[PDB]
């Protein structure tokens, strides 16, 4: 799941981080943050049930 885009321009963090100003990179970072958090929550819930 780490290679998905979730709406950003790039799925990797270092490319967007080292190519744009943080005032613009905030949105691209936020999209990845929320997507990865959702993935982790799903994994944890499944583990609890099992």
């Amino acid at each position: 799941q780490l290679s998905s885009n979730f709406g950003a321009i790039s799925s990797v963090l270092n490319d967007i981080l080292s190519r744009l100003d943080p005032p613009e990179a905030e949105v691209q970072i936020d999209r990845l943050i929320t997507g990865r958090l959702q993935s982790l929550q799903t994994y944890v819930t499944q583990q609890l049930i099992r």
Binding site: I9, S18, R19, L20, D21, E24
Partner: protein, 100 residues
């Protein structure tokens, strides 16, 4: 807490490329192409210096889309395109992505 090994020493890797692109020939071109027949050329195998262009006060507007202009001297590409054309009157601001 957690244990993480910090890097020991920073290294920098960028080649010793020498040749310079002829940016002065397109910025000081004798005649420019028309809007309906805009010229497009490809530049490669040369060093492009954007610090001189950005610091120059002979330009009216300098807007960059997708990449910050202050980090253009460190990144590396594969090829670039130079689109040269002349437009008069209003509607100058419409030259940008996602515009009508």
């Amino acid at each position: 807490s957690n244990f993480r090994v910090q890097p020991t020493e920073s290294i920098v890797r960028f080649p010793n490329i020498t040749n310079l692109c002829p940016f002065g020939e397109v910025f000081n071109a004798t005649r420019f192409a028309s809007v309906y027949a805009w010229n497009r050329k490809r530049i490669s195998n040369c060093v492009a210096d954007y610090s001189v262009l950005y610091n120059s006060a002979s330009f009216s507007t300098f807007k960059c889309y997708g990449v910050s202009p202050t980090k253009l001297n460190d990144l590396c590409f594969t090829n670039v395109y130079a689109d040269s054309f002349v437009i008069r009157g209003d509607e100058v601001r419409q030259i940008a992505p996602g515009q009508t």
